[PDB]
Amino acid sequence: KSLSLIAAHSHITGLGLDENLQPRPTSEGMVGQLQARRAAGVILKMVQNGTIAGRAVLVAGPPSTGKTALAMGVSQSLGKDVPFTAIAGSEIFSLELSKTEALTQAFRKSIGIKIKEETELIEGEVVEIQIDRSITGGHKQGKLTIKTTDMETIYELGNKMIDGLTKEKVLAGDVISIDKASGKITKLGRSFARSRFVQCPEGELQKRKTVVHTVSLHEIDVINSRTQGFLALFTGDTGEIRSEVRDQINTKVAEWKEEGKAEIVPGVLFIDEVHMLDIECFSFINRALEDEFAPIVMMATNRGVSKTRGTNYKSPHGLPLDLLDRSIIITTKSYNEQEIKTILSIRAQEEEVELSSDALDLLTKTGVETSLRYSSNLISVAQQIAMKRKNNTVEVEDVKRAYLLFLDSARSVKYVQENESQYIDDQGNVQISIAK
Amino acid sequence: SLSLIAAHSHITGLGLDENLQPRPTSEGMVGQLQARRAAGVILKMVQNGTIAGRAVLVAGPPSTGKTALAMGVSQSLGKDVPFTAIAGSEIFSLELSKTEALTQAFRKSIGIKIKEETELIEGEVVEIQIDRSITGGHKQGKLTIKTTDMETIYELGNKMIDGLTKEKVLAGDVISIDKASGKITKLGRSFARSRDYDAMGADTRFVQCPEGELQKRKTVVHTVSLHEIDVINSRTQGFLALFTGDTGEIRSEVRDQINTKVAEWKEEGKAEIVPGVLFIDEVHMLDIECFSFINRALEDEFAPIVMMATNRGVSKTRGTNYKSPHGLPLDLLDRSIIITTKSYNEQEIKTILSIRAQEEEVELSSDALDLLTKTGVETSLRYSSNLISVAQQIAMKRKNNTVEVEDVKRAYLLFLDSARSVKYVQENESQYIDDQGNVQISIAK
Amino acid sequence: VTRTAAHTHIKGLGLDESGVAKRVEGGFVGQIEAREACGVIVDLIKAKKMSGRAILLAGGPSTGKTALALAISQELGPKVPFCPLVGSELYSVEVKKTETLMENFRRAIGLRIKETKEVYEGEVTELTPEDAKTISHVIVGLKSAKGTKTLRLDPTIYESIQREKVSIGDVIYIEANTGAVKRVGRSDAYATEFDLETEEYVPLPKGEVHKKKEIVQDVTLHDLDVANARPQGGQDVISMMGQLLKPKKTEITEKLRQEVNKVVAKYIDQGVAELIPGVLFIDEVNMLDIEIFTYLNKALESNIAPVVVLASNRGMTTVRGTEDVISPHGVPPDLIDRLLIVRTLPYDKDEIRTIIERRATVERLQVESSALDLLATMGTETSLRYALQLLAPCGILAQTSNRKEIVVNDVNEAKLLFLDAKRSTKILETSANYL
Amino acid sequence: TRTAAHTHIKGLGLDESGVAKRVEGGFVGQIEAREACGVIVDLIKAKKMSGRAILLAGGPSTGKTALALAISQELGPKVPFCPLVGSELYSVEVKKTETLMENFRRAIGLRIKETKEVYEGEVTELTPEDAENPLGGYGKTISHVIVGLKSAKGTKTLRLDPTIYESIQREKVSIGDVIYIEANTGAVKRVGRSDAYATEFDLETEEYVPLPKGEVHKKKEIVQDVTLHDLDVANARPQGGQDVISMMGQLLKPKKTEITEKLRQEVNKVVAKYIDQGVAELIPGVLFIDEVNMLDIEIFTYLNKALESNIAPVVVLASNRGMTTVRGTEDVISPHGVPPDLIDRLLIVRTLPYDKDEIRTIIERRATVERLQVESSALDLLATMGTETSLRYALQLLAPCGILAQTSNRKEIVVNDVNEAKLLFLDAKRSTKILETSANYL
Amino acid sequence: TTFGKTTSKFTDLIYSSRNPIKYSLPRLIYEDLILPNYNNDVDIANKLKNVKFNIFNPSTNYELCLFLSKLTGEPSLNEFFRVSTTPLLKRVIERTNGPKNTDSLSFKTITQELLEVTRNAPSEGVMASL
Ligand SMILES: Nc1ncnc2c1ncn2[C@@H]1O[C@H](COP(=O)(O)OP(=O)(O)O)[C@@H](O)[C@H]1O
Ligand SMILES: Nc1ncnc2c1ncn2[C@@H]1O[C@H](COP(=O)(O)OP(=O)(O)O)[C@@H](O)[C@H]1O
Ligand SMILES: Nc1ncnc2c1ncn2[C@@H]1O[C@H](COP(=O)(O)OP(=O)(O)O)[C@@H](O)[C@H]1O
Ligand SMILES: Nc1ncnc2c1ncn2[C@@H]1O[C@H](COP(=O)(O)OP(=O)(O)O)[C@@H](O)[C@H]1O
């Protein structure tokens, strides 16, 4: 389940918080940033309460300060069965959808409906199957013996059950699941009988089982529109769904909640790099947040006073002031030496790399000096240099060798700036020849 | 009825005599005693139909009556003559070229007239008897068709029976049969057989049983534009493209073929050409490519008469970097004659306001109408025209039948024109978002 | 249970019978003149006589323009169509922007049809077709818990029955007018014919076979336009898998529109349909190009145009698509002649305090007096929206300390945790690299 | 009769092997351009050269378009002529290169002659003759089919193949129908029903056609004219089969596609093969692109490429610019808006503006064609307008003068009629003077 | 695929191939949005939008049908109502080559009379080879 090699945020299992929403210094893979974690815990409580809608928050700070780490912590603390959509700023610039339509689809993907239904099921291990044919074979008679670990029974079959058993061959000793009302029979496997391999089911054979469904508003939006089927949820060409089906879906969902047949589960939409949206997207986002079925929007940006896209002026955070008026802003700060070394030790534990104390100190020094991501990339590349000399622990010499082999930002700018005759400039001039 | 009181629906035709002399106020139009005469000359030029492909230009300040003049020409043109009214922004299409959209708008304004003579047998079917020969190649038929008054018996051919087996007809079915063309339609089911089946179905409909004679003779005249023939002769099932707009850059070869076909039909004598008027409101926002195509597309024999309206002075033509008079290049202005509209005085504004208040069922006092006339001299005319309609509702909120001075004063207080909005914006410019995006939301500094 | 999103304390304009507005009634505080002008416009809409009336309401940000348009929508009632819109939505990659404007215009004119629902439901007891090969009629006997009832049927409904594979003993659903046939399932009394079968068993209906109900259908003109202009073809009732070709939005010809108008007028003349004109509302009108602004001039002169309401917060701003045109509110001077402008005023301290108290009441929160004074001072110092957004984290921080009433300390912690735009810009200015 | 800005020009107006006279073919003046255009007509009629470009240049309203239609009139209706505007090439379906190549291929015509052997007439009898010894397991084994035909002054019975019986049964041919039998392929088809059976049934849905004239059997040589673009779009469109894709594309919107060079190559080789047999004949025509100042430089480079082909026609361009930048380039100042690489490939013909007498004669002939009678002093006044404001402004102010004359119940156009026409309709100069001296937000 | 496989006088071979990806849908959405019942109006609105307010209905818009019949040449006036209410795949399957009357405005293009000659034409003909 959920195959993954190692992620860059794989150590974050949530927000480290107490029962009084106080952040521990080291919990759940998150260290430091006490005020930002407290604010994100308040936002998490806002989402889990579910009584308010359409509030936008902004996580702003310098680069490499843990904004995406905060978003991943909120997403892991939400758990399953709550919608979480994560998009980038450049994702909505489509050739087949308008920008407002893509933003609308991303908005309605983040709110879901919890529907609870029950179905009656058959589960057991097949003992013996008899199919009988007549002289002409016009009618078919049958008997099926099926057992669990507690009972055993024999059923008399009709024509459509016999046809459904002949199709998708079922032999003796197979564990199968039968849905009577739909006629779908699945082979769970084979029982443990030497004389795939699953165990024989226990308890009753006729079980009424309850399955809790959660379906987003965008799925019912696609299915209710007749212009395409449910295969557009996978192929991805929905093609500018009309508004009137969305008002029908809104009214139907409202009366479903009134009757008690459904519950509304709002979620979080996360927009990473929100400064790359046009001003039309910002103006749509301003008026899309006052709807009753609107999620809580999280935006993350790292710019200063920069040019807003599609305009000719400059704005704080790259966003216009009317969008910033409806936002509450969480500010992240830079890290210390101890926080950097704790981050590097946690990244060592997740990458299964054993480090010396001196190697950790050198990594902390070069991480304070250059970048946190540079040391977090150097630590995994030092282990291969250590393993080429056939030893397990990563020492100082491996870190110095990796620091010599792989450059960083400021050093690369420094070697470029006194060798610029060999590189292609903004004017397209270069010197390739060695002499003259 | 599906029409409400529009902006200018008092204008019913051009107010002219037989000698092309405009009356001071007749059939909706007040004043403009030279533009109305020029538009009457243009109307006679259209109604003669002997010349083709000539463009006129209606230039003047805003709120003067250019589109009022176009509406007058449209209403006095009469029916069965094509009149296309488009804007300059319509032709910028994602799925059509600008030149192709211009060609479609040109060919939507010239049509031909086709005369059809019908012999209809509309009645209820009583019984169908089918008789076959010994060989069985052909089938004979007996039809008993019944009206409220009389009933007779007809015969059928083999193709009649084949067409009648499709769109399956039983007893109690209202059909109509053409003698000359053999057209078959199923009108629906009679109301006399509406109590037997007990449940309707999807494809059925109930119509009344017809009365009168069975065989009725009637002639029909159809007016078909050239664009309709272009769309029909471009695909297998082309009428859906007529109603959905997915024609998609019809080739020139079928247009030349249709032009030769129309010339052949005119020479033989089963059709005659009815030319029309194309009206392009706000022509100044057209590309230089569009102006070039309009220049070279007016020299064809099947070209309508083009009316363009502009309220721009010496502005910059779109698609270029220089400025030209009326926002149009000099090559198009060489191929034009210009009708100039001039602004009004107090009396013409008074008469126009009285006519507009007469149409909206609004009773004004003399002093209230004088106040509205003074406001229309100071501000624009349309501000007073809208003030009439809101002061009417202010009057019924006071339980009064006719409006007074107080209702016009209250409507002046509650609603603002352009100059007062500019003034209150300019004296509080810190509360509004400027071109650089700066604004102040907090009220305390 | 109950959700709240920036509104829903706004219930109406809060006017008396004379058209005058009270101070605090209907969820609105302040702004008497704009509310009274909007009530006059609501009366004009209810008169149902004029077409192409354009109103612009202008003011600063967070002054109450969208609340006024929402109050218009609540005052008109659910019967009148209301089509809210943002100006950025008129740009699409499928059709041109003028066609999208035409569709949004025609979405604001509605119709009301009075229809009757007639339903036969029960267990099939007899199914006897007969030849007149072509069957002339079939006789179906239905059974419920309150008796049985037999029906004659046309052969088309028998064809639809043969589509659904209906046998003796199935519970079916027949609609008399449309002719739709739905198979609910096999009846519960026939459930022990086999020990195991692929058929679902449903009980008998406990009511009568015959059911009669009067309903009202509300459609708009745009629904008829898109129903009459399917390019691929008429879709069936049920298509779980998609169409083989993707149907794309097209440029609907005005000939189709005039045919729809002719058919609708013919049905109106027979007393079947009722015409309900409505309101088209375009928020952030300064985001329109000049070509849409030119097309609005001709679109307002039609005979079936609705009442159009526009909003803007800009000052003397360049119109989009132009470079040397400066106009008030970002609206070009050719179009600004055609409207009536309603001015909207900023608020004072006491109005801000009353708004904050009303928002705390609707969100089911209790606040102290000193917390209310601090929140009012913060609202006057930063913005009105900041205190409204900060009200709910104050409630959460009061909840985590096991209390039900917000005090000054929770407001101080919420002010510490979350910033406004001014303090964020102050941090942005005095920073080394990118905040 | 409809007149639209033209149709008073009938050819150029030269004599044989000599100078064009001043009064001929509706042309006044422009003698050197008429002689050069006559030399161009002789070059086209020589049917030798390919890819020759001619640009005619001059001021507005000088007679460039009139010279192009004079070229088309002098060549004849059989030679193809494709008039073009420079804005027509920008399309939203294909690239402008493909549109230029399609209009390039539209200007080459092909003359194909063919001999048809036919068999038509009313069906008299229709008898599938049985064989002498039938095979087992079958019924009605046809040995041959006897069909009798009937036309005007002719009656002939035919012995046919057994395999046309399926063609009889598909087209539903019965006795009394009039059919059409091609000789070599068989492949009968129903023209309709005979006119003698029109009163057979009271009500029917059939098409009764007169009985055909002439003999039943005849040999007719049919000469057909198609262009190469028709051959390209017929060969690109797949031949009518039973696949769902072909009939789906028939039922859908016919979007244009980029025709490959391979198909044009095969079309050229099969056309040259049948030209070498003495059957087909190639007729090159004229592609006239007017106001070529509006073309992008990519189209100019593709014109440079496509003028070197073997099958190219003669292309005529026209422009009214002087020193103007080429579109798509910010600094290439070039004569007539044409880049200098193309200008080297073409010859330039110069057109000169007119005088008082030429304007007066042109106005007189336009009034003659428009069926109006103008008094001589009114003609002198109109010539004064023509030399004072514009020739075209004088030409468009003839029909309102006739309308104002018919309003006053006169068939003569006189001085006060054209004074009222001055007063009612303005030209560009007075409109500009009104625009410059008015500040009422105009 | 996830088909019915054997975990080892005739043998039955039935097509049983499925997709491993399963999309689950609740019964409430289907039964309350897609199927007609007493408390919804799927069939009523379908009839209202497809039959009563259709512009090709000859019981209410006979003039348009007669106009289109003169334009195209269809012998039946119910042809347009049948074309507009059936899907494109069903239209292109059961399409027949029915005859049309000559007195119409739809005549034959040049490309069509080129293509209709060479349906059964043999080789060595000039028009067939071209
Ligand atoms: N407080 C923290 N606790 C644990 N890991 C952190 C913390 N802050 C940053 N990181 C790690 O640092 C790396 C880079 O930080 P990132 O969140 O990508 O920066 P930004 O906020 O600019 O996106 C990530 O892998 C993240 O897991
Ligand atoms: N001659 C006229 N007679 C009556 N009403 C007029 C006249 N000219 C203009 N109007 C009124 O002025 C209003 C707007 O004028 P309009 O025709 O739009 O001027 P323009 O076309 O120059 O913008 C119209 O509603 C019309 O009722
Ligand atoms: N007079 C008022 N009474 C109560 N609430 C108001 C009032 N004016 C504005 N508001 C509130 O202010 C919030 C933002 O106002 P908004 O409608 O967005 O103004 P604008 O659209 O001009 O920005 C809304 O949630 C609204 O409830
Ligand atoms: N030499 C000529 N003889 C007769 N008519 C002419 C002559 N030159 C120009 N014209 C007339 O002048 C009108 C406009 O000329 P046009 O072809 O538009 O010139 P250009 O192509 O230079 O713009 C045409 O209607 C044409 O009949």
Residues 6+ apart with CB under 8 A from C1: A51
Cβ–Cβ < 8 Å for D63, D9: no
Q: Kindly report the number of other CB atoms within 10 A of residue B162's CB atom.
A: 14
**How far is C178 from E46, CA to CA, in rounded Å?**
9
- B chain contacts of residue A308, beta-carbon cutoff 8 Å: 437
Of C91, C196, C389, the CB nearest to A161: C196
**How far is A421 from A431, CA to CA, in rounded Å?**
6
- What DSSP element (H or E) covers B206? strand B206-207
Q: Is B62 in the pocket of ligand 2 (CB under 6 A)?
A: yes
β D208-209/C135-144 pair status: unpaired
Q: Do the chains contact at E91 and D233, CB–CB below 8 Å?
A: no
Which residue's CA lies nearest to atom 18 of ligand 2? Answer: B63
A201 is in an annotated binding site: no
D61 is in an annotated binding site: yes
For chain C positions 156-215, those within 8 Å of chain E (CB to CB) are 173, 175, 177-178, 180, 182, 211, 213, 215
Question: Chain B residue closest to E62 (CA)?
Answer: B187
Ligand nearest to the CA of C60: 3
Q: For C107-198, list the strands marked E by DSSP.
A: 109-131, 135-144, 147-153, 170-175, 181-187
Q: Resolution in angstroms, to 1 decimal, for this deposition?
A: 2.8
3-state secondary structure B374-400: HHHHHCCHHHHHHHHHHHHHHHHHCCC
Cβ–Cβ < 8 Å for B278, B106: yes
Cβ–Cβ < 8 Å for C95, C104: no
Least Cα distance to A20 among C48, D290, C399 occurs for: C399
Which residue's CA lies nearest to atom 4 of ligand 1? Answer: A30
For chain D positions 26-65, those within 8 Å of chain B (CB to CB) are 60-61, 65
Ligand nearest to the CA of C345: 3
Question: Separation of C375 CA from ligand 1 center, angstroms?
Answer: 35
Pocket test for ligand 4, best of D3, D8, D10, D61 (most atoms within 8 A of CB): D61
Least Cα distance to C122 among C146, C153, C157, C156 occurs for: C146
Of A166, A234, A261, the CB nearest to E28: A261
Least Cα distance to D282 among D116, D82, D107 occurs for: D107
Amino acid letter for position A256: W
Read off the tokens for C179. Answer: 């002719």
**Dihedral angle computed from the Cα positions of residues D252, D256, D258 and D263, in that order, rounded to the nearest 10 degrees:** 80
Residues 6+ apart with CB under 8 A from C266: E60
Q: Do the chains contact at E84 and C233, CB–CB below 8 Å?
A: yes
**Residue C135: C-alpha distances to residues A181, B168, C158 (Å):** 33, 13, 9
Read off the tokens for B293. Answer: 């195509």
**How far is B59 from B310, CA to CA, in rounded Å?**
5
Read off the tokens for B362. Answer: 């609004």
Q: Is C247 in the pocket of ligand 3 (CB under 6 A)?
A: no
**How far is B405 from A248, CA to CA, in rounded Å?**
48
- Atom index in ligand 2 nearest the CA of residue B60 equals 22
Cβ–Cβ < 8 Å for B276, B82: yes
Q: Is B68 in the pocket of ligand 2 (CB under 6 A)?
A: yes
Q: Kindly report the number of other CB atoms within 10 A of residue C408's CB atom.
A: 13
Question: Separation of D26 CA from ligand 4 center, angstroms?
Answer: 10
Question: Chain D residue closest to B274 (CA)?
Answer: D2
Cβ–Cβ < 8 Å for A201, A145: no
| Residue A203 φ then ψ, to 5° | 80, -150
**How far is B430 from C410, CA to CA, in rounded Å?**
33
Question: Separation of B278 CA from ligand 4 center, angstroms?
Answer: 25
**How far is E43 from C350, CA to CA, in rounded Å?**
55
D389 is in an annotated binding site: no
For chain A, the residues whose C-beta falls within 8 A of a C-beta of chain E are 115, 117, 166-169, 171, 174, 187, 190, 211, 213, 215, 220, 223-224, 230, 233-234, 252, 256, 261-262
Least Cα distance to E128 among D235, D166, D218 occurs for: D235
Question: Chain E residue closest to D204 (CA)?
Answer: E75
- What DSSP element (H or E) covers C342? strand C339-343
Question: Chain C residue closest to B429 (CA)?
Answer: C315
Compute and round to an integer the Cα radius of gyration of chain E: 26
Q: How many CB pairs below 8 A link B and D?
A: 196
- What DSSP element (H or E) covers C367? strand C366-367
Cβ–Cβ < 8 Å for D329, D323: no
| Residue C291 φ then ψ, to 5° | -70, -40
Compute and round to an integer the Cα radius of gyration of chain D: 31
Q: Which residues of B138-160 are buried (b: 16+ CB within 10 A; e: fewer)?
A: ebbbebbbbbeeeeeebebbbbb
Q: Which residues does a 6 A CB cutoff place in the pocket of ligand 1?
A: A 8-9, 29-33, 63-69, 302, 343, 372-373
Cβ–Cβ < 8 Å for B230, B262: no
- B chain contacts of residue D320, beta-carbon cutoff 8 Å: 331
**How far is E130 from E113, CA to CA, in rounded Å?**
14
CA C80 to the chain's CA centroid? 11
Cβ–Cβ < 8 Å for E73, E48: no
Cβ–Cβ < 8 Å for C168, C125: yes
Least Cα distance to E41 among D231, C218, B366, B83 occurs for: C218
Read off the tokens for B435. Answer: 């071109």
Pocket test for ligand 1, best of A38, A372, A375 (most atoms within 8 A of CB): A372
3-state secondary structure chain A: CCCCCCCCCCCCCCCCECCCCCECCEECCEECCHHHHHHHHHHHHHHHHCCECCCEEEEECCCCCCHHHHHHHHHHHHCCCCCEEEEECCCCCCCCCCHHHHHHHHHHCCEEEEEEEEEEEEEEEEEEEEEEECCCCCCEEEEEEEECCCCEEEEEECHHHHHHHHCCCCCCCEEEEEECCCCCEEEEEECCCCCCECCCCCCCCEEEEEEEEEEEHHHHHHHHCCCCCCCHHHHCCCCCCCCHHHHHHHHHHHHHHHHCCCEEEECEEEEECHHHCCHHHHHHHHHHCCCCCCCEEEEEECCCEEECCCCCCEEECCCCHHHHCCEEEEECCCCCHHHHHHHHHHHHHHCCCCECHHHHHHHHHHHHHCCHHHHHHHHHHHHHHHHHCCCCCECHHHHHHHHHHCCCHHHHHHHHHCCCCCCCCCCCCCCCCCCC
Least Cα distance to A398 among A371, A344, A358 occurs for: A358
Residues 6+ apart with CB under 8 A from D27: D9, D12, D13, D20, D34, D63, D66, D70
Compute the half-sphere exposure of residue B163: CA atoms within 13 Å on the CB side of its CA.
27
Read off the tokens for B283. Answer: 């022509």
D415-424 vs D399-407: helix crossing angle, rounded to 10: 120
Cβ–Cβ < 8 Å for B362, B408: no
DSSP-assigned beta bridge partners for residue B380 = none
Pocket test for ligand 1, best of A65, A76, A302 (most atoms within 8 A of CB): A65
**How far is C143 from C126, CA to CA, in rounded Å?**
10
Chains A and D touch (3+ CB pairs under 8 A): no
Q: Is C333 helix (H, G, I), strand (E, B) or coil?
A: helix
Residues 6+ apart with CB under 8 A from B264: none
Question: Separation of A315 CA from ligand 4 center, angstroms?
Answer: 59
| Residue A144 φ then ψ, to 5° | -125, 125
* Elucidation method: cryo-EM
**Residue E17: C-alpha distances to residues A167, A168, E5, E102 (Å):** 10, 9, 10, 53
Question: Separation of A332 CA from ligand 1 center, angstroms?
Answer: 11
Question: Separation of D65 CA from ligand 4 center, angstroms?
Answer: 7
Closest CA–CA distance from residue C107 to any residue of chain A (Å): 9
β A305-307/A296-301 pair status: unpaired
Least Cα distance to C329 among D45, E119, D126, B422 occurs for: B422
Cβ–Cβ < 8 Å for D335, D126: no
Of B166, B233, B239, the CB nearest to E68: B239
Which residue's CA lies nearest to atom 7 of ligand 3? Answer: C64
Cβ–Cβ < 8 Å for A379, A363: yes
Cβ–Cβ < 8 Å for D112, D223: yes
Compute the half-sphere exposure of residue B333: CA atoms within 13 Å on the CB side of its CA.
20
Interface test with C, best of A325, A332, A333, A371 (most C CBs within 10 A): A325
Q: Which residues does a 6 A CB cutoff place in the pocket of ligand 4?
A: D 5-6, 26-30, 60-66, 362, 392
Q: Is C11 in the pocket of ligand 3 (CB under 6 A)?
A: no
**How far is B209 from B191, CA to CA, in rounded Å?**
7
Closest CA–CA distance from residue B202 to any residue of chain A (Å): 20
Least Cα distance to C10 among C424, C358, C360 occurs for: C358
**How far is A17 from A46, CA to CA, in rounded Å?**
15
Interface test with E, best of B120, B169, B185 (most E CBs within 10 A): B185
* Rounded (5°) CA angle D276-D277-D283: 60
Residues 6+ apart with CB under 8 A from C393: A42, A46, A328, C414, C417, C418
Compute the half-sphere exposure of residue B75: CA atoms within 13 Å on the CB side of its CA.
18
- B chain contacts of residue E57, beta-carbon cutoff 8 Å: 205
A372-388 vs A357-369: helix crossing angle, rounded to 10: 140
